[PDB]
């Protein structure tokens, strides 16, 4: 039923998936014990997209929990809604990656990836008609950034026709979390451009700024950020799970947003985001949703979208409305912001409609965009990598696992090639 | 004895089919469950329904239509909807994986395992039919499965049956307002396919219907359902001549012999009138002269085309209700006396009129009011080349740098197709601009 | 936190929202003797839905003269035998329908076949083959209705020993 | 006063017999216990059931059939099932050891001590009836006891009764779907025995019916019960002419005289139409034209063979219901006009059609719907040699290395039997080849 | 009394000659030993084999072929193959040292010691001939020894015989992929040599027929054997007119008098239809319109050249089977009607059609299926300039840095010889450019 599987590795991916699954269970009316307690029939005809079925009338998510240390999974199961994931989907190393890309990708990752690949293969073969894969990970860690991308490479080698969609959280230069961040970041993103059909970037700076300035929460935790990420996650596959006037699946998004095979990096956003103070004092309508979803400060990335130009964009309206306002607003915003949209391609805005809004809301908008402003991230990362690498700092830890500087050099050159070919479209005129 | 076979392919095709079959069910008085509520007996000497419905023998009737789509969403929705007892279950052909807005997916990779079943069902449907008149096909062009599968079916029926007439109520994209970005590609490809396979094509873009609803019904929040109802009304008004009385009965054959001077020029844009809500209806005149004059005004065109920028070649006007031929020809003469509509020199007579005696039916919960007179007009004009020119512009500006080409190439599509499609579109526009010259 | 869930198709057309427990039980007995299949339309019954009683025109009669026809056809030197003939056909058809009982939502349905002069039997210009043996046939579909009977002529026991 | 005798040998044979006797018990209204429940039943000349049942002198009725099997489980299941009071206690002959898929076991060692009792039962049942039409036998080829007992009983009957007609509805192994691994061997042996001892042989392959059930009834997991019910329907449609009056009746002797041109060739394959589910029965027309066109579709063959690869020589079609000879003749004319189906040169007319008035009966709790028009079709065609060629390939691939042959030589039969049976099959394929050549 | 002499030079020539002679002997009923078996029906049809063979007077036959090569492995394989019994053991001329893909070695150093014996054998074969039509030569242009010996043989025969007809089936390298690295040099030099020394040349690059066998045969691991099989099938289809009767006969003479507008323009490119996979149960029938449509389909062209980019001069095309001239004429009318196939201005008629009654023979164990109709098309069109342009660009890039030039200078070939080939190729490209322009 054009169903998809989930894979999550590293502690960031584990937390994101933990929140995402309870959001989906809330949307589908699934209790922590795995028994359906919904109200309307509309929650069961597409339940097989995300949940497999088991004896006793219960449902189980088709997600793989992968990591090189058991603490994260010990915490995620000990938390609420831990009963959903089957015990067999847990796979773990015992030494940890040490935030070292080589350890997580070559020494321990290579020897342990057999079991996770086996469970992935059996899960994929169990389903009727696979639609694709979705991945959640961090590029700045060891276990995620290494073994997740290794598994990406293997599954791309094994399943060439299916599509892959990745949610990667990348370092913002302001929040410094690890001193070896650029190394494993580039060694990961070097293999994404050849394998990942869709990559969507997420930033902790962006999440912090949004949660403080729009939501106005004085003491945010990781929970609300995870909730924002989960909402933006669930908005994407809405048309694939619920009826609507203009359905659009992941392959439609890919084909209709990718101009060229090496420009598959996106920035995402969600609407409506409002503070808890004025939840009832504003009107929720298509004009306001459209006005908010194009604001630069609502975007889930540190890059400023008004420093570049949009190539393609997509909006997935949810709820009951009329197409007139939708298309008219898209046309008007394209007309008024002609400077921010590249000119040699006309009508670069995607409109999709699903007829089921989120629980407790009326109309929601998920926005995904490809623009020439995302390369500021890559320029910063490349500059930082060059500054650290020019004297071979921290290099011996990597090289002691059989590593050589030629692959580092070619990955850095690949970054330069990507940024060059991605910025040369900014001034390209027919 | 006389029948027409209906094909609804693509999401837009299915969503138009829903409304048109609702309209037909209401018009013939058949219940949604499919049972005729008795009280139509007494030797019942009229098969007013064989054009669209065929009896099962005792009670219910089934339509002579087939539904095709690759995504099971809308098909399963119809299967679970209020019309679950009406349509034949396995003539609801449902695919498995969406064409993903790509022409190649629907024309070269996934369409083969569906077209065989579709042709088999069309054969089985036609076998029971004894007096088939032709095919009607409803599809959207700016969609992958729509364009590709519609093209493949048109090609297959073109060799399976041949001379049998087929009419296409295609939905081309609007000039500025549209949904996708890749629609020029598959639109050019689909017009390539249908040019040498469709006898008559009708323009049905969306923004014109939007503006019509805004101006006349005064509804500022329209949805696809209203447009579907308008298109359904057009179809019923056109086809009612086969199943109702008239002073001048017109068959579908009076299209490919009266509205198409040349084999290549068979694209027309339609119009419908009157369009009045229930509030302003009782305060108006709604005379034949007024409804005829309002039909020819540019803003009532179903398509975004300005007729004053081109000439007229052939107009077919069907009236239904209590209309009088004296008034009809009086209005026609007044139109001819009026200047701003000019015909081509080599066509001195250019009107074909049909009269039907059944007044239009009104749908509950609908927007239109109950009226005693209505007219449907189909026009062939040389100004239609504007939409083709603008579509060619939108094509080649972004084709110049080869965007999105890999998506088609890697699926199995040869790159050379775009060039020859550009070529025959250029040839067609050349023919249109050549015809418009004076003799 | 309410889920809503009334899609555009449902809100536009309907949602069934049915299946009472006894409803299906009551519906069941309809298929006990309802039998899938059909005969064929007997031809000359297929036609367009005739509306006017008069050829090439509306017969519209109404108090206002501009649309009463009979008032508008009176310029002839004589009375046009057609208008009053249709009047007679309508009134006679109403009475005839009264005898049987049809109330077919309008008089126009049965007027198609209330006018035929064809007699039930032949009028001595063709063989009295009747209207067809198949016409006088009635069919039930209970098992074992068409078994043989073995009448007396074929009902022999003893198989005589000698010749 | 006309009766037929039914033989069920093998586990599959007993399972088929259970369903066919359930259908027969229902269609004459016989209660499962065995007594007439109406109490309005009359005497005189209403003994239509005599073709299958016999009056027992006190109350009930006993079927005219015998069950043979060497493995007691299925016989015990029958003796403990819902039909305990129906069958005669000493009519279900049971063995003690199963043949364990070995032909020699059932043809040389064990079957000799069961064949005598079976023959005694056949004789004592036979002298009861006076108008013996013939014998029908059911057996699965790919089973040891089935094949061995079938062969031995056929040889014994061919010399004990002589000219009595024999029809064998045999279950050959499928070309790719099979349970055992040694079925080609005993299939070869059974074919050698059966070639010169049976008058008519009917293919009953399994995967064909599997595909038909999956395609038509929309059942994803049919079991043997559905298979047996369809087989029972086919047999009832075949036999109904002997116990129900009709316009054009046929007899058992009327099939071989019009279906086998030569004594050597007597193998043919069947079809049944229509196969429609309850929900499907509504939204369809169900006319003689479409049912007879469906009957000739290659997917509707009861055996996995494509007639398009060969020629036709004879076919018998039996209609039951309210059909008419003129309509069936028009359908025949359309078939003859059709070019996809072609006949052999020396057979200008190859149709033997029978008409019966009794519509098919429906078993409660079944899958198939009911309509008042059904057709059963028995065609002999040249293409049937394909399955023999495939089974020959299977036999060769394992006889090259002499696999499993020790468990054939160890029960007394010599290894020379394989070569003889192979040569006989090769000659049969030869004959089926030259029979189809043009003069 | 009509014959043709065959020359096979180079390795690819050897493996293609093996295939074509296998096909010829199989078609004419000659066993590999060369002994025609008298047990076959009748025998000795007129003198059908006279075109390719010569009777020994009592016993076997000798093909009119000669094999030339400087590397002994292929000749030894031929002599040790099953065709050891057939060929004359002195006409398989084998050298000692290969040219190692060096044109200078094969044209100036070693080939002079073998060309004398080669021409002596040619004279000996020609003495037997009495009604010789011409010579066929097979060679891969990307091989040093093959190119050099083919050239030398050509300019030798040009003065030895004069106006004698010569047809060369050159194996040109693929546009972008190849196995050689210095093949531009030898290809350009050999083209320079043979431009004025051959009557007909045929383009047979490998990757196009790779695509053909991939798309049509549905084979994903075909080898050079299948490629040679297709080439041999094309050769037999072309040459069947000399040895078998037909409605319209066309000999070797009626090719260069039909396809050659000017003496320099004698390069043609081929296609063949239909190509059907053998591993299919049903083959349907096909027909003339379908086969000609497939033959003129640009992607089915045996050379990697798109005719859509250029204009057509000549099209000579041969049917074999049971074709009807009315069907041929209708197909030609439809092709001329089609817009994508456009002719040059000065060629109102550009079609030659030949007809032969024998269906193509199918080789047992082959990949092709048996079909009763086939067509082989040979075209001369302006689009062939692109391969020369690409080879010119590649050779310019090669010669920019004077790479590999010393290992051609070192065998006595003058340094500036490459410049003359440059200028002549440029002149040929200019000629192609100027021919296509209209007046
Ligand atoms: N007027 C009108 N147009 C519609 C409607 N539904 C779809 N369309 C048109 O369809 C176009 C896009 O194609 P879709 O119908 O959404 O999808 P498709 O034709 O099935 O092709 P795929 O997307 O590949 O499945 C839009 O541009 C609309 O103009 C409708 O209900 N009314
Ligand atoms: N169509 C059909 N085939 C059956 C059925 N039961 C058994 N068979 C066939 O019988 C074959 C195996 O032989 P069985 O009938 O099980 O047993 P047998 O023929 O008595 O021989 P033994 O195994 O020695 O007892 C299987 O391959 C099945 O194809 C049935 O109910 N329907
Ligand atoms: N069509 C076809 N071409 C072949 C085959 N084998 C080799 N070739 C072509 O032959 C060219 C090179 O020549 P060779 O086959 O090596 O033999 P040669 O022409 O005598 O040259 P040398 O290798 O020096 O002996 C390559 O570019 C191939 O394209 C074959 O089996 N079929
Ligand atoms: N949004 C969010 N980010 C997280 C969470 N946990 C960790 N991170 C981010 O992950 C980054 C560190 O990744 P790391 O744990 O080293 O990756 P790993 O070693 O592969 O598991 C930090 O910069 C955090 O911002 C979480 O629960 N939510
Ligand atoms: Mg769609
Ligand atoms: Mg058994
Ligand atoms: Mg060589």
UniProtKB/TrEMBL annotation, chain C:
Ranges where the record places region Disordered: 127-148
Bias class Basic and acidic residues marks the residues at: 133-148
Q: What is this protein called?
A: Uncharacterized protein
Span of the entire protein shown here: 166 to 328 of 329
